[model samples]
Target: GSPNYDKWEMERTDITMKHKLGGGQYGEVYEGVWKKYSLTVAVKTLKEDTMEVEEFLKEAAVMKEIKHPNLVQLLGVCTREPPFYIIIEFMTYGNLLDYLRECNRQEVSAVVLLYMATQISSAMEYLEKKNFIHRDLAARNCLVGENHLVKVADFGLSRLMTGDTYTAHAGAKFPIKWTAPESLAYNKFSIKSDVWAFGVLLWEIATYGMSPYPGIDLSQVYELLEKDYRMERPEGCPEKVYELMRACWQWNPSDRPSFAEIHQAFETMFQESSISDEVEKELG
Candidate 1:
């Protein structure tokens, strides 16, 4: 047997599925626990018979790509049953968009926003090193666990890059606002494009959940990109962080810094953020 098989096998037989957490097109996530380990987990269950054994395992095998704290880790998988499920680490607060909006936990916001970026980029840094690309890198696709742990998730479109790019069908759907110019025009996706989306995600964080390019048409932004047009600095967005977003907003793919550079930039800028100082230094 290949290592992929044994890697995803459940060690125990009595895992219990609790109440439902959320659901979507492919499946729903349930609150669950690996009863033996007493470990709480998220069980993402598929519609019965929706996927064949080999097809399901193939994706499971591919996703078992291991070991990152900021990635929603897949813990176990089962195929024989009607409602096949993949168990992953349970996230207390689900998607980051909701977490950002619902959180009342007292701008310690700038501090923790930077903290989230650090952890997220750390994951992307590792993903880049592994030569893979998360085609969708946005606040909505990310998840928050307890202790402010934000993990990059929703691997539906994530893939290992055989070379440097994943070109999709011209008609394939994508989130236009967060997509890179080249990606929008040519359907070419690369790590650099992911960098482009990361900039939009930063704008999202800085604005506290405001949708990117509000009231501006997507085609209009597409046209504006030719002239080096990027969105204005989001309110409460620090000067240096805005600069970081600009670095990511580069129209030419080669000009954008890699995820590693993003992480380093965040690290250097992190210590400078103080809620009191920023509050006292409020804008004119």
Candidate 2:
């Protein structure tokens, strides 16, 4: 390690861990602020029993390399010992899912939703061109920053592709509700699967954070997909935006549009309606 090693290895003493936010069975997330830099960060730590540190290091390295305005960033890490830490930039408004529900179709305009989607697609575009397959792409996994800005987070399930399709072995937990049909059946994740999940995310935004499918149980998702069932467009979803969602959900992975393509669609749509005065008209 050198004099500038602080960028890589942050000591526990330097980080002021505040109240616990949330966590999984083996990990915990904290709201912490770095007094030195006056930066607030979200701390994700691996418990001693949370399996191999090598894997933790693997994800940390993957997280540190990416830089995108729409991507949730890794600020620092403390990998020196038993309890490992991943200190990342904190989101002001928490996740998009709850943020959507907080208003519950109240104040958030349709154009704002489209703007959020536009940001996310480019985030995936950054990862897409770099060959990172984001296995988990959901509204819940996306964070809402200041001014309703949305950034994708939770790379825990993300994989650096060996090829196009990255398959996972059984016993690894995944969400059936937000999953692509191909991945659910084949246990694989590809750019296409990410696209499919992004489509579901679009639906989530369209519906103002309602679950992907209404009254649909987890076990029934695969079966439902077998019948070519897709969720209907949300009540106020823009026609063009919903079309992009449908394109992303193409059953054949190859048939789906790239994140870049999806981004372009929204960027144009977002621009056409982004004149600031349309918010009142476009919102209804």
Instruction: Note the clash tally of each candidate.
Output: 0, 0
Writing each residue's lDDT as its tens digit, candidate 1 over 6-113 gives 656674356788887744422366788888777889886664856455656665765698579998788888766656778887788888877888777473367888
Best by lDDT: 2
Model 1 is weakest, by summed lDDT over 10 consecutive residues, at: 158-167
**Model 2 residue-pair collision total:** 0
With a 3 Å backbone cut-off (N, CA, C), the pairs that clash in candidate 1 are none
RMSD to native, candidate 2: 5.1
Task: Supply the TM-score for candidate 1.
Answer: 0.84
lDDT of 2 by residue, 163-245 (tens): 21223436656667778887877877898899999998999888888877888767777787778888888898878887888
lDDT score, candidate 1, position 191: 94
lDDT of 1: 0.77
